[PDB]
From a paper:
Lipoxygenases (LOX) are key enzymes in the initial step of lipid-mediator biosynthesis. They catalyze a regio- and stereo specific dioxygenation of polyunsaturated fatty acids to yield fatty acid hydroperoxides, which can be further metabolized to a variety of signaling molecules with diverse biological functions. [name] is the LOX with the highest relative amount of bis-allylic product reported so far, hence it is a suitable candidate to study the molecular basis of the dioxygen positioning at the bis-allylic position. We demonstrate the importance of an active site clamp around the pentadiene system, which fixes the pentadiene during the reaction resulting in 11-HPODE formation.
A key residue that is located opposite of the iron ion and hence likely restricts the space in the kink region is the highly conserved Leu304. In general, mutations inserted close to the iron in the kink of the channel had the strongest effects on the product specificity, while amino acid substitutions closer to the entrance or the bottom of the channel resulted in smaller changes.
Author numbering:
A (entry chain A): 1 to 569
B (entry chain B): 1 to 202, 206 to 569
């Protein structure tokens, strides 16, 4: 029941124990790497999943055994026989929400602002990419308008998702036995550009909604081998959306999920253990939001990014290519850590709260991820500030905290996570800078991970909406498209089963809850502050419910009751 | 890194530390009960499975997803279409060893001495039970002999498995939807008597089944005595006897007398012994993950809708009653359930020999191999405790050890009324026997009853945990459909394979190889000698398996865990 205190304020015998405790934690929490990704060398037993967590995780795996027994899907690398079969994969599981409406263009587009990866869409400024040769004739034909691309861009109506990150990927390979011999096949890579337009009129109703304009499946334009597809292209348009969804799913899993929630949190958990005493106020604040994070990252090391793991079998590129994308997304996040704060991140894509027209309306008014995440970001910020101000009243105490200074030096260190863009001037000198750091770490661990992890089942457990790999080249625009052509593009049965298995495991339960730690703060002042944060969460929950009532489709993933306290699944 | 020491041999400051540590442990290891079974209230995080364990357990679960994906079995309460379908449940799993030869009478009988439940067979003395009216005409017709039942009993040739303990079971019920209507059905329970005979001729002598009476009260029409000359009726009779053996195995031999009887010893260790107490340092490596696996059994095995509810013959309530009665009888006669005394009480111990000095049951691989492990463990804990206890007064004056015993004997501490003589632990050799039996149960015994489960109970027709139709009339015609209706429906056969695969996927630890070494150099030396003996025992068992009809691998030291952990 020790009261938290800064190291400078203690007695040389108190300081001695802190150093002893820190020395013990350093031995227990040793730094390691797998394929260049920072991870703990050996996991401490105290950091393992609880018994309660294991019981829930086992219920999800047993439920997959039962659902597989009921299902007609087979353990083969053959395609499905019918498109309808993809809808029979859930006899004993909840039906994914996107399954009925996934063919609709609005449903396709909405996923950009309310699906599993609401992190790619950016507003177009000045012009389109020169490798994306959309013409005025195309835009006017799709929008049934006389407006030009330049006029639409000048008014902030055009948005784009550019998947150039996957352009350098080496295509994944798979093999199997079919009649005594070994078959070797290769996945098809795509790095599409997708143009979206915001339509105030909407489809029939006056609500308004983002609509997709064009898709170019690969980066280098060519009128024959890589044309621009539009909604008027019919079946070809449908296939183009499949490849775009595959791109979004690969960026989601590599960049948005694994890299920028799970793995960028690992250095902060390790630096907290390696530099902060158990009774340090920052350790007492951050640790609830690290519960099971080291453990779930070890499972990702063993099951997700391993040879034969989920990323190896399901994603578009080779395991080596996927890990290269993951590490590059980690480095850019760490180099520009402060710039990936939620308001600055949205503003850099031109879809922040500040991006408005002359009237003051946002260019992208319907962004449920943005609106709900902003509420959680602001509430966490207030909570962190009140908490830290209980222990930091003057910025000199920030500068005089040796454990905190070591904590920052460990993070910016090459072997400690290389968070080069953590602080300004090479040192942490102000309370408000530490407020922003702790705010972003808590926001990533809870709200952000909730927003990318939980929609995975609703949108990626139904394979046709977002297949993690495509298994045939895009058909020629002139070429006829049968059901078999699509079934050959979509994943074979065994790999579709593997994708459902992965998505079900990720969203089967909530290991903890935002603002509700296992152990109450020893300090009464901290407990009152935590209580205030919980009260704000209840208010935010009610506001989101009100927002959901008027929204086209409810967006439930950032409801406080659905946000975990930590990245733990 | 604190040298182990007895509490009375410590300074008052040191004693205060032990009392504080013990008080902390008492708060973390609180006693709780589920359906009258002593369990832990809250599992401490340090007692959870490791990350390494969870990785192995997840591999086994994922393998069942993949094996299910490659199977043609469906999620229905219908029977299989063909008996052959039971052999196609393992496209991506190891084929159970018993699958090819389970119809053979010798393979049926040898499971009594080398199967998952080698704990039931007992030698017949004086007479058969009066409710088991086997006649000289039956015995002579089966053995193709003129010897009488009395003469064979006088020579110690006859053995019996009497499953009367299952006679008071309430039959289990299952229900399911069919055409908008809810079908409700009931399992069929049996409490058979099975007569076996030791046949020297066979060359190598082997045990042979002679008669099966499916239920306890004899009746020539509704419960006759079946013999190998009854064809398909004999085959069905063996099914019901195997079902009985499986239910006694899971309720009595596995859950009750490995997992659950170990629980009070783990909690008493945490509640009465300091961390540097020599007995705690000796036993804790053999308790690794035991509290955790018992919590999973509480949640998945004996729970409403759990494995025992779905798979076993009786209702969950009926099964739990059998479990608790086995626990209580074991605790009341704890010393008597030591391995040599247990075997001797069933008349199949090393001392049950004829006039020539030959054992009445020469083929008993469980007995021979377990005796080797029992003797080696006994030497190991004798030398270990000799390092800390040199004279009897130390045992008497060890206040933590005396509280340890008093906690175990107490009603809320597991009621181990037969743990100790004279109401008090007074001698060193008594503690040797207690620790030897606890370590033998947690490692060797659990290995013997747990790991044959896949090889003998994952192939459903060899040992179905429940039967789903009454035994047909002795003169009724038997079709393949009659047997398929007796065997479990598809969904429950899948559930049984699911259970057996998780139980035998991996070995969480290994006998004589703890995670952390003893801080005492003398203690480490004792352990090293124990490992050397395990190596020697491994070679001797390998030689025995070369000279045996079928190899018995489950008590090889490399296959025996250090603790009951799966
Ligand atoms: Cl067009
Ligand atoms: Cl075209
Ligand atoms: Cl007969
Ligand atoms: Fe996740
Ligand atoms: Fe077991």
């Amino acid at each position: 029941m020790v009261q938290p205190s800064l190291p400078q304020d203690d007695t040389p015998d108190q300081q001695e124990q802190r150093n002893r405790a820190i020395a013990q934690q350093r031995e227990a929490y040793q730094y390691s790497e797998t394929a260049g990704i920072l991870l703990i060398k050996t996991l401490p037993q105290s950091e393992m999943f609880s018994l309660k967590y294991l019981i829930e995780r086992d219920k999800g795996l047993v439920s997959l055994i039962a659902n597989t027994l009921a299902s007609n899907i087979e353990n083969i690398f053959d395609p499905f026989d019918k498109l309808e079969d993809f809808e029979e994969m859930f006899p004993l599981l909840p039906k994914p929400l996107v399954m009925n409406t996934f063919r609709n263009d609005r449903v396709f587009a909405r996923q950009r602002i309310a699906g599993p990866n609401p992190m790619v869409i950016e507003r177009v400024v000045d012009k389109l990419p020169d490798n994306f040769p959309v013409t005025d004739a195309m835009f006017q034909k799709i929008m049934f308008t006389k407006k030009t691309l330049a006029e639409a861009i000048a008014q902030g109506k055009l948005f784009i998702t550019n998947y150039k990150g996957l352009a350098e990927l080496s295509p994944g390979r798979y093999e199997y036995q079919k009649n005594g011999t070994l078959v070797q096949k290769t996945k098809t890579i795509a790095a599409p550009l997708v143009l979206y337009a915001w339509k105030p009129e909407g489809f029939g109703d006056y609500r308004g909604s983002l609509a997709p304009i064009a898709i170019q499946i690969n980066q280098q334009p060519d009128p024959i081998t890589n044309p621009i597809y539009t909604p008027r292209d019919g079946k070809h348009w449908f296939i183009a959306k499949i490849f775009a969804q595959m791109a979004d799913g690969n960026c989601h899993e590599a960049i948005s999920h694994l890299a920028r929630t799970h793995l960028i949190l690992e250095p902060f958990v390790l630096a907290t253990a390696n530099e902060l005493a158990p009774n340090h106020p920052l350790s007492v604040l951050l640790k609830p939001h690290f519960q099971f994070t080291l453990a779930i990252n070890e499972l990702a090391r063993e099951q997700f990014i391993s040879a034969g793991g989920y990323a190896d079998d399901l994603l578009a590129g080779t395991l080596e290519a996927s890990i290269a994308v993951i590490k590059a997304a980690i480095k850019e996040y760490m180099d520009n850590f402060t710039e990936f704060a939620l308001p600055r991140e949205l503003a850099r894509r031109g879809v922040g709260i500040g991006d408005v027209d002359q009237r003051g309306e946002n260019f992208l008014p319907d962004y449920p991820y943005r609106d709900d995440a902003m509420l959680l970001w602001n509430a966490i910020e207030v909570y962190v500030r009140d908490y830290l101000s209980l222990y930091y009243q003057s910025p000199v105490q920030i500068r005089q905290d040796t454990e905190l200074q070591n904590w920052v030096r460990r993070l910016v260190s090459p072997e400690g996570g290389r968070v080069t863009g953590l602080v300004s001037n090479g040192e942490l000198n102000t309370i408000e800078a530490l407020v922003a750091i702790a705010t972003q770490v808590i926001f990533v661990s809870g709200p952000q991970h909730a927003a990318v992890n939980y929609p995975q089942y609703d949108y990626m457990a139904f394979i046709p909406n977002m297949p993690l790999a495509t298994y045939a080249t895009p058909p020629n625009k002139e070429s006829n498209i049968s059901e078999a052509t699509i079934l050959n593009i979509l994943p074979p049965q065994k790999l579709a089963a593997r994708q459902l298995e992965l998505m079900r495991t990720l969203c089967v339960f909530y290991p903890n809850r935002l603002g509700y730690p296992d152990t109450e703060f020893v300090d009464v002042r901290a407990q009152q502050v935590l209580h205030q944060f919980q009260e704000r969460l209840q208010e935010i929950e009610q506001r989101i419910v009100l927002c959901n009532e008027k929204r086209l489709e409810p967006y439930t993933y950032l409801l406080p009751s659905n946000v975990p306290n930590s990245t733990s699944i």
